[PDB]
Ligand binder design. Structure first.
Ligand SMILES: CCCCCCCCCCCCCCCCCC(=O)OC[C@H](CO[C@@H]1O[C@H](CO[C@H]2O[C@H](CO)[C@H](O)[C@H](O)[C@H]2O)[C@H](O)[C@H](O)[C@H]1O)OC(=O)CCCCCCCCCCCCCCCCC
Ligand SMILES: CCCCCCCCCCCCCCCCCC(=O)OC[C@H](CO[C@@H]1O[C@H](CO[C@H]2O[C@H](CO)[C@H](O)[C@H](O)[C@H]2O)[C@H](O)[C@H](O)[C@H]1O)OC(=O)CCCCCCCCCCCCCCCCC
Ligand code: CLA
Ligand code: CLA
Ligand code: CLA
Ligand code: CLA
Ligand code: CLA
Ligand code: HEC
Ligand SMILES: CC1=C(/C=C/C(C)=C/C=C/C(C)=C/C=C/C=C(C)/C=C/C=C(C)/C=C/C2=C(C)CCCC2(C)C)C(C)(C)CCC1
Ligand SMILES: CC1=C(/C=C/C(C)=C/C=C/C(C)=C/C=C/C=C(C)/C=C/C=C(C)/C=C/C2=C(C)CCCC2(C)C)C(C)(C)CCC1
Ligand SMILES: CC1=C(/C=C/C(C)=C/C=C/C(C)=C/C=C/C=C(C)/C=C/C=C(C)/C=C/C2=C(C)CCCC2(C)C)C(C)(C)CCC1
Ligand code: OEY
Ligand SMILES: [Cl-]
Ligand SMILES: [Cl-]
Ligand SMILES: [Fe+2]
Lengths: 82, 34, 334, 137, 442, 36, 341
């Protein structure tokens, strides 16, 4: 019924367990938060900010239309915001 | 007489560590305004 | 030795090839009336004016339908929720034009199916069984009630009950999606989970038991002959099966109690179908699926479409096209 | 794009004077439009009379022109038919009929400017969608 | 020997602790009634119709006549506060008695007092407790009568002049009317008891029900079951539970159809229009609009050949056209002024439609009971904007779900009660399997 | 190896999930994706 | 006793999560398919491939987030990170739909990994490999829908996007364009899925209500011992019950459990085949006899003709926003609409 690993119930009721994870768990939560609040997640993944979906007087989707020019096409759209 | 770091240990944190990080990021998102 | 007691003894006899029972006394006639009317109408009924607009829809084989397109067509929108037995029509010709057979069939069937569920309790008691198989069957019965009675009640007309046909069934689903966005409703989502999961677990339990059959046969014979009807020992090795499945995932994610396992098998699809039956029944009162149309806008206020807005475009095309001659005013309120 | 002041600049009267609302007013107007008006005028249409919408071009051809703050503020007080021939306060919410339309009861003069402004700003953001109907959803 | 998950089944033969459970649970119900009203009142805004505000308890109090005047306009919110506070306070008393009897009080009552102790198999004691509660129930229905006839009356949506609170001086006593309702078919244009359409019939039926319940109480206190009743039922706690589960289920389905169709004891002023009502109001709205423009709505042929605004029902009555032909059984105070002996009167339509009727129709058409789970009002293809789901949709769907599950509970507990009483709810005796002692089917 | 009672860990983690889920549900009504 | 056997020893050790040779394939790919989907639905848009928001970061909820398919202009490009389209730029790769192929391909190899795992564990534990065989049905569905179907069309764009509402849109597309409900191969799949659910419920119900009394508690679960030799419920009583209730009943435990494997597995395989046909627009769209009659006889109407009108509505109202690269512009006057609506 057992293969040698320490039982889960034995672990999460232990004091050493909660001494470490009371730090690691919030720290991870805070790190994730900061990835968003600093705006880093936008830049890493290329996701439009609420103000950068369209240019001001634009209602056309900036749709990729070329396979091998696709990279340059997105950068063209992005500069038409900057 | 229980090993701490095991294959099990790796499997678990492989899922747990990003799940909490993601949870924090998704939490922050709730306060974004347009 | 009294005539009435002999009759009671035969009705409840456990020796009849098919159990009759007191619920059977109502189920046998109502199911025969429904079945006989259904067969005849499916083959030879004339076109029915389902939507009350004098636009009769042809449902039967002899009027140019095949097995896939044929249906017994719901009764006229002019009738609404009014009772329309045969003796309320000036003639059978009138009764046929207005969709009278649909009411006869669905009422006799819902009764007979209701007594079908009670008959399952009844025999379980005569045989000294536990009583709850009928509770499992209440999930399909609730589903039939929803599409044939409950949804008609909420919308005010049997003309919006589910047609008794294959293409009619699809007509019903498409319109229900345009009108209630059922796909975005959590009780239908639970129903898909009950029905996918039930198919999954059916397959799993079938392959695990089949995988751990104890060798009792040669390769020239069907392994099925390694089981004899009524043998006392189990025909498969539940610990080998548990030992395989507990390693495929991990140990505690596998049953080794057969009673918990089979209860899980009963519970999962029964409950998911309860919900999907309840989904139809509550959308009958127009508490619809989640509406996320235009939920995302940008810093100026442009709508930023999501997949839900695409769904809505599809829904709109079903909406503007269904019952194309039947609406005089801009809102389809029922 | 964003809610720039050009977007928030709408005509005040027929004479041609303009007015620049704040983002606060715009959001206030949208909130009040939803409270007092959306049930009939969601998206800039009119569910109970689809022949009349809230497109700026439709308002402009109304008698009293209604494509300006004054025209709208006056309409919310003493509404008339499209040609100005008859007053319709008895079948349309207004301050004059707040006894029969109780939601107009607690609307202040600044509330009306906001509601009006939202109606004039929104076709600048959504274009054809405003007053277009399901075709543009 | 029940598992923790069937743990309340341990209370079956502990009449003391089982009393605590029941009384504490009664506390929860009274508490919710208290808390919810206060929550609704704190959120109430009188300038908005109730049905634009997610209210389900304030309308129940308004209907009893409290807090409202002509046309259903709220004139005094203090009666709402009182009902919630008193309910809230009372829940502590029930809570108190409930956790006392469940924790500290005697575990079983029959040793303490032969009056309050009971054996489930005591058919006489059981019918006496039934009788007590029957009398209480009968008193309950007479309180509604008392309020109606001696304490301000009730809200009358059909009152002349837009609806008003009205004291009821001539409740209907004629049993041909009162029990006539029990014998109308439940189908369209009949509607069984859901069709009750005036407060005289409502008050009168409660006189009857009140008397019949008081009559049945004493009956069941003075009698014990006859042998035909004794041979026909299972006499056990779980059986009695299953009987009431069936009754609660049946009652839940009726309540569902009641709040969905009936606009009398669920006034549309408070609850919003019904489905039929709202659909009728749309046809009315565009009849009024098109005829103001010059359309002769009586002679207008629609695309199908049927009249665009007006057609006949299958028995001949002039009714609204379009898909709302299905709803011609609808009757409402804003509509009936237009009906003559043949249905809708074309001369009344051309001449006698009032602005208040136009207002009402536009209002009900735009408040039809259609809306999304996240409370986006209107058809499923509507864009976000209107935050609205009719109280009638909320009240109909919730109680259909509850009614369905209690029918499943009836089946569950009825079959188990039968199996337990016969002695095989735990499985089949290997040494004595019935089928093994039966002849084979073939 | 057993100091913290299990039901304590269960209750607290339970309320931790409820908190985060309710934050996500609050967020459906505010900010992005609120329709407003 | 060289390095290969020392590795074999380690991979096949009885541990909390069995690894095995198949683990080398399964776990990396299963984890990265999963990780890609959670990453993309949290952080990645579909603005440039679809014109859709599709992440929590953008304001979407669990029902509307998706990892969407690449733009139609990518054709069937593998969209490798290092490939000619994204050219090693991770940001651009995300914006061009690279996570879709990343998930679909790593998912394909994970499903292989998982099925090899079922073979591997079955071999070591000594059981017959029927659970692996049954898993052929999920795999056939996955490859026919996610890979074979878009490969027959113009691009990956028309594969399903990995998300809840995006799959819903997939269902409705197949109704309006392929008339997929009319396909007999789908109908067989429906019968297999609903037949499986039925078999699942009816079998579990029957076992639980034909139990032997093997203990005294009112909880019947306790009274089963996983090593007992005896059947825990009566097959003889169950056969009688169903023979009398339904006319026929199972009498062979082995057949019954094989049938439960057979029914849903076959159903899924059948639906995979029809999707292969839809890869080629080889639909069962029409009945020719119906249309000939309908074209000549304006009073002829069936539920078949009514449903196509719906299909035509779906196509005209959803195509412009659903296929944006086609620049469909349908003026109001050309849209098919019934009266008033
Ligand atoms: C003991 C065992 C029982 C065995 C009994 C066997 C025979 C039972 C037959 C019941 C079948 C009922 C069909 C419902 C028909 C319908 O129109 O039912 C609705 C009617 C209400 O009728 C409507 O009633 C209306 C009354 O309003 C009228 O009057 C109002 C007055 O305010 C308004 O003015 C309104 O405008 C005006 O129309 C009109 O008459 C409508 O035309 C009419 O449709 O409700 C009703 O009579 C109330 C009762 C309906 C409850 C049943 C609902 C079905 C629940 C099935 C659950 C099964 C679950 C699955 C199980 C597994
Ligand atoms: C892990 C977490 C553990 C909990 C998980 C439990 C699983 C199920 C519960 C889901 C958990 C999410 C609930 C919180 C979100 C919520 O609901 O939040 C919604 C509201 C709070 O949100 C408010 O919701 C309102 C809903 O509109 C209501 O208010 C509007 C403005 O007044 C209008 O009046 C409108 O008509 C009226 O419907 C508005 O949208 C407000 O703007 C918004 O703030 O909470 C409510 O209402 C509170 C309702 C609680 C009682 C439930 C009543 C529902 C029973 C009727 C349904 C029967 C079943 C039908 C089956 C289908
Ligand atoms: C008046 C109503 C009533 C009463 C008094 C009983 C009483 C009883 N029932 Mg029955 N039951 C009822 C209605 C009722 N039931 C209904 C309507 C159904 C169908 C759904 C059932 C189905 C049922 C089954 C299947 C079984 C019982 C059993 C029992 C016994 C033990 C129950 C127990 O310990 O529960 C313990 C309580 C729980 C385990 C908690 C349940 C949690 C529910 C399911 C979730 C509810 C959450 C809610 C929907 C939303 C939550 C929101 C979130 C924030 C949390 C007891 C005698 C057992 C029995 O037969 O004993 C003899 C048994 O096996 N009941
Ligand atoms: C309305 C819900 C309800 C009610 C009233 C009861 C009531 C009861 N249950 Mg049941 N039960 C319920 C739901 C309910 N249960 C559910 C959902 C489950 C599944 C989780 C169970 C599972 C269950 C089991 C497994 C058992 C019971 C038992 C009991 C009885 C004794 C409990 C005891 O001694 O605990 C003692 C507990 C405490 C002392 C802890 C504190 C509890 C108090 C009362 C909290 C009160 C809080 C409140 C704010 C106080 C305000 C006071 C103020 C008004 C003055 C009691 C009559 C037992 C029984 O039958 O005994 C023979 C038993 O074995 N129940
Ligand atoms: C049983 C009848 C019933 C009915 C018809 C309603 C109906 C309503 N309530 Mg009330 N409510 C109830 C019970 C009920 N509630 C209970 C028991 C509580 C205590 C928790 C509340 C607490 C409550 C609050 C605090 C609020 C409401 C509000 C509302 C409105 C909007 C509801 C909504 O958006 O749900 C959203 C939908 C769901 C949550 C779906 C739940 C699905 C369940 C889990 C499935 C059921 C499984 C089985 C039982 C609506 C008029 C709101 C309102 O407008 O107030 C004026 C509001 O703020 N209600
Ligand atoms: C129907 C519910 C119910 C039932 C059957 C019982 C039954 C019993 N209780 Mg319990 N009890 C209840 C509710 C109930 N109680 C409540 C609600 C409370 C909190 C107030 C208590 C608090 C309580 C205590 C503290 C004790 C008992 C005791 C007893 C026993 C003897 C009581 C006696 O001699 O009567 C005495 C009777 C009276 C004084 C007459 C009271 C008549 C009332 C006031 C009229 C009816 C009230 C009405 C319905 C609601 C008020 C109106 C409101 C709506 C505005 C008996 C087994 C005793 C026991 O067993 O201890 C060993 C004991 O010590 N009970
Ligand atoms: C909650 C209320 C309640 C409950 C649970 C009981 C329970 C009981 N009563 Mg009592 N009874 C009550 C209220 C109640 N009664 C009231 C208020 C009165 C006064 C009129 C009576 C008058 C009364 C008498 C005169 C007798 C009983 C008897 C009995 C016992 C046998 C009942 C029986 O065979 O039913 C089974 C019912 C039938 C076999 C006949 C069913 C016929 C119905 C009306 C058909 C309805 C069909 C349809 C589906 C329902 C829709 C409504 C329809 C009428 C339109 C049982 C213990 C009997 C007994 O043994 O007394 C000691 C007896 O002789 N009761
Ligand atoms: C239904 C009960 C309505 C509500 C609530 C609101 N409006 Fe309305 N509006 C309605 C109708 C039936 C009409 C046409 C009446 C006629 O015969 O002309 C209107 C018209 C308007 C207009 C004029 C539109 C035009 O093109 O000229 C405006 C500017 C207008 N309505 C504004 C408005 C506002 C600001 C509201 C909230 C206070 C509002 N309406 C509510 C129906 C209904
Ligand atoms: C037995 C049991 C149980 C149960 C319990 C119960 C159910 C209870 C009840 C109880 C209750 C049921 C309670 C109640 C309470 C109440 C109270 C406590 C009250 C108070 C109130 C107040 C104090 C108020 C105040 C006020 C006023 C006066 C005015 C207005 C404002 C306010 C609101 C503030 C359980 C399951 C858990 C467990 C097991 C056992
Ligand atoms: C208030 C009111 C009113 C009145 C009412 C009344 C008058 C009622 C009555 C009612 C009643 C008077 C009812 C009754 C019922 C009954 C029932 C519901 C029955 C049941 C039955 C059963 C359940 C049985 C069963 C069985 C059988 C069949 C066989 C044998 C076995 C047994 C016994 C099980 C009106 C409407 C006017 C109006 C409004 C208000
Ligand atoms: C892509 C990519 C990658 C990878 C990545 C990954 C691997 C990721 C992962 C990630 C992850 C791994 C994530 C996670 C997440 C999680 C979450 C976000 C969760 C959530 C959940 C929740 C929300 C839940 C809740 C609940 C409910 C609702 C109910 C019941 C209870 C519970 C609590 C369960 C790499 C680097 C290779 C590179 C390339 C790209
Ligand atoms: O969905 Mn659309 O809504 Ca219910 O009615 Mn009005 O139209 Mn017609 O009769 Mn069948 O269908
Ligand atoms: Cl149609
Ligand atoms: Cl219409
Ligand atoms: Fe099995």
């Amino acid at each position: 019924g057992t293969t040698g690993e320490r039982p889960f119930s034995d672990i999460i009721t232990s004091v050493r367990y909660w001494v470490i994870h009371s730090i690691t768990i919030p720290a991870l939560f805070i790190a994730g938060w900061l990835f968003v609040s600093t705006g880093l997640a936008y830049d890493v993944f290329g996701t439009p900010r609420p103000d950068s979906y369209y240019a001001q007087e634009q209602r056309s989707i900036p749709l990729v239309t070329d396979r091998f020019e696709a990279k340059q096409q997105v950068e063209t759209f992005l500069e038409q915001l900057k | 007489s229980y090993p701490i770091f095991t294959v099990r240990w790796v499997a678990v944190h492989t899922l747990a560590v990003p799940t909490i990080f993601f949870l924090g990021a998704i939490a922050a998102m709730q306060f974004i305004q347009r | 030795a009294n005539l009435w007691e002999r009759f009671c003894n035969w009705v409840t006899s456990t020796d009849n090839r098919l159990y009759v029972g007191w619920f059977g006394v109502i189920m046998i006639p109502t199911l025969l009336a429904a079945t006989i009317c259904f067969v005849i109408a499916f083959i030879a009924a004339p076109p029915v004016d389902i939507d009350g607009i004098r636009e009769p829809v042809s449902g039967s084989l002899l009027y140019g339908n095949n097995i896939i397109t044929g249906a017994v067509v719901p009764s006229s929108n002019a009738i609404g929720l009014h009772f329309y037995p045969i003796w309320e029509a000036a003639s059978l010709d009138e009764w046929l034009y207005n969709g009278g057979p649909y009411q006869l069939i669905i009422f006799h069937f819902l009764l007979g199916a209701s007594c079908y569920m009670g008959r399952q309790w009844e025999l379980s008691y005569r045989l000294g069984m536990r009583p709850w198989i009928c509770v499992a069957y209440s999930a399909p019965l609730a589903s039939a009630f929803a599409v044939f009675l409950i949804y008609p009640i909420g919308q005010g007309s049997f003309s919006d009950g589910m047609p008794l046909g294959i293409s009619g069934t699809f007509n019903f689903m498409i319109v229900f999606q345009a009108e209630h966005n059922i796909l975005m409703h959590p009780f239908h989502q639970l129903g898909v989970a009950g029905v996918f999961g039930g198919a999954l677990f059916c397959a799993m339990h079938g392959s695990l038991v089949t995988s751990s059959l104890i060798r009792e046969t040669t390769e020239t014979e069907s392994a099925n002959y390694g089981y004899k009807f009524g043998q006392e020992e189990e025909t498969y090795n539940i610990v080998a099966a548990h030992g395989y499945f507990g390693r495929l995932i991990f140990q505690y994610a596998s049953f080794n109690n057969s009673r918990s396992l089979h209860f899980f098998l009963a519970a999962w699809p029964v409950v998911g179908v309860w919900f999907t039956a309840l989904g139809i029944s509550t959308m009958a009162f127009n508490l619809n699926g989640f509406n996320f149309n235009h939920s995302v806008i940008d810093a100026k206020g442009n709508v930023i479409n999501t997949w839900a807005d695409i769904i809505n475009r599809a829904n709109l095309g079903m909406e503007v096209m269904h019952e194309r001659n039947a609406h005089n005013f801009p809102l389809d309120l029922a | 794009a964003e809610l720039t002041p050009e977007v928030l600049t709408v005509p005040l009267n027929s004479e041609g004077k303009t007015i620049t609302l704040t983002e606060k007013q715009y959001l206030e107007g949208k909130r009040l439009f939803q409270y007092a008006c959306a049930s009939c005028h969601v998206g800039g249409i009119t569910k109970t009379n689809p022949s009349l919408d809230l497109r700026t071009e439709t308002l402009a051809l109304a008698t009293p022109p209604r494509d300006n703050i004054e025209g709208l503020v006056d309409y919310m007080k003493n509404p008339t038919t499209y040609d100005g021939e008859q007053e319709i306060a008895e079948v349309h919410p207004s301050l004059r009929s707040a006894d029969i339309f109780p939601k107009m009861r607690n609307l202040t003069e600044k509330d009306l400017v906001a509601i009006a402004g939202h109606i004039l700003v929104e076709p600048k953001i959504l274009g054809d969608k405003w007053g277009g109907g399901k075709v543009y959803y | 020997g029940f598992a923790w998950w069937a743990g309340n089944a341990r209370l079956i033969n502990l009449s003391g602790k089982l009393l605590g459970a029941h009384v504490a649970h009664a506390g929860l119900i009274v508490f919710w009634a208290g808390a919810m009203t206060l929550f609704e009142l704190a959120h109430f805004i009188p300038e908005k119709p109730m049905y634009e505000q997610g209210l389900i308890l304030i309308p129940h109090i308004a209907t009893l006549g409290w807090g409202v005047g002509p046309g259903g306009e709220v004139v005094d919110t203090f009666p709402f506060f009182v009902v919630g506070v008193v309910h809230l306070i009372s829940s502590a008393v029930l809570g108190f008695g409930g956790v006392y009897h469940a924790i500290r009080g005697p575990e079983t009552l029959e040793e303490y007092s032969s009056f309050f102790g009971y054996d489930w198999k005591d058919k006489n004691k059981m019918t006496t407790i039934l009788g007590f509660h029957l009398i209480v129930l009968g008193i309950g229905a007479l309180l509604l009568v008392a309020k109606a006839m001696f304490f301000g009356g009730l809200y009358d949506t059909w009152a002349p002049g837009g609806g008003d609170v009205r004291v009821i001086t001539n409740p209907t006593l004629d049993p041909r009317v009162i029990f006539g309702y029990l014998l109308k078919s439940p189908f369209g244009g009949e509607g069984w008891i859901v069709s009750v359409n005036n407060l005289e019939d409502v008050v009168g039926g409660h006189i009857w029900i009140g008397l019949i319940c008081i009559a049945g109480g004493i009956w069941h206190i003075l009698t014990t079951p006859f042998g035909w009743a004794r041979r026909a039922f299972i006499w056990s706690g779980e059986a009695y539970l299953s009987y009431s589960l069936g009754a609660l289920s049946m009652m839940g389905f009726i309540a569902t159809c009641f709040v969905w169709f009936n606009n009398t004891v669920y006034p549309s002023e408070f609850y919003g229009p019904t489905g039929p009502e709202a659909s009728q109001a749309q046809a009315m709205t565009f009849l009024i609009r098109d005829q103001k423009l010059g359309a002769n709505v009586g002679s207008a042929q629609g695309p199908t050949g049927l009249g665009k605004y007006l057609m006949r029902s299958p028995t001949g009555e002039i009714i609204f056209g379009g898909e709302t032909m299905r709803f011609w059984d609808f009757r409402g105070p804003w509509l009936e002024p237009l009906r003559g002996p043949n249905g809708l009167d074309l001369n009344k339509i051309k001449n006698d439609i009032q602005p208040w009727q136009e207002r009402r129709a536009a209002e009900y058409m735009t408040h039809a009971p259609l809306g999304s789970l996240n409370s986006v009002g209107g058809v499923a293809t509507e864009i976000n904007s209107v935050n609205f789901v009719s109280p009638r949709s909320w009240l109909a769907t919730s109680h259909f779900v509850l009614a369905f599950f209690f029918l499943v509970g009836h089946l569950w507990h009825a079959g188990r009660a039968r199996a337990a009483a016969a002695g095989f709810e735990k499985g089949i005796d290997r040494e004595s399997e019935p089928v093994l002692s039966m002849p084979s089917l073939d | 190896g057993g100091r913290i009672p299990l039901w304590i860990v269960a209750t607290v983690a339970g309320m931790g999930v409820i908190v985060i889920v309710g934050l996500f549900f609050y967020g459906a009504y505010a900010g992005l994706g609120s329709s407003l | 006793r060289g390095w290969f056997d020392i590795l074999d020893d380690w991979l096949k050790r009885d541990r909390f999560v069995f690894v095995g040779w198949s683990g080398i394939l399964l776990f990396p790919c299963a984890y990265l398919a999963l990780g890609g989907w959670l990453t993309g639905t949290t952080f990645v848009t579909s603005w440039y491939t679809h014109g859709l928001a599709s992440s929590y970061l953008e304001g979407c909820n669990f029902l509307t987030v998706a990892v969407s398919t690449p733009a139609n202009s990518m054709g069937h490009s593998l969209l490798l990170l290092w490939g000619p389209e994204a050219q090693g730029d991770f940001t651009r790769w995300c914006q061009l739909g690279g996570l879709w192929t990343f998930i679909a391909l790593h998912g394909a190899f994970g499903l292989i990994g998982f099925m090899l795992r079922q073979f591997e564990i079955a071999r070591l534990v000594g059981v017959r490999p029927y659970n692996a065989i049954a898993f052929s049905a999920p795999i056939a569905v996955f490859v026919s829908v996610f890979l074979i179907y878009p490969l027959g069309q113009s691009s990956w764009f028309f594969a399903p996007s990995f998300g809840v509402a995006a799959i819903f849109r997939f269902l409705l597309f197949f109704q309006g364009f392929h008339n997929w409900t009319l396909n007999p191969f789908h109908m067989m799949g429906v019968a297999g899925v609903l037949g499986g659910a039925l078999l699942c419920a009816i079998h579990g119900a029957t076992v639980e209500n034909t139990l032997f009394q093997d203990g005294e508690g009112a909880s019947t679960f306790r009274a089963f011992n996983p090593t007992q030799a005896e059947e825990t419920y009566s097959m003889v009583t169950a056969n009688r019950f169903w023979s009398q209730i339904f006319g026929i009943a199972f009498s062979n435990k082995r057949w019954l459990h094989f049938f439960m494997l057979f029914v849903p597995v076959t159903g899924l395989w059948m639906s995979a085949i029809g999707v292969v046909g839809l890869a080629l627009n080889l639909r069962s769209y029409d009945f020719i006899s119906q249309e000939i009659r309908a074209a000549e006889d304006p009073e002829f109407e069936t539920f078949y003709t009514k449903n196509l009108l719906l299909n035509e509505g779906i196509r005209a109202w959803m195509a412009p926003q659903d296929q944006p690269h086609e620049n469909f512009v349908f003026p109001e006057e050309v849209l098919p609409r019934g009266n008033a609506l």
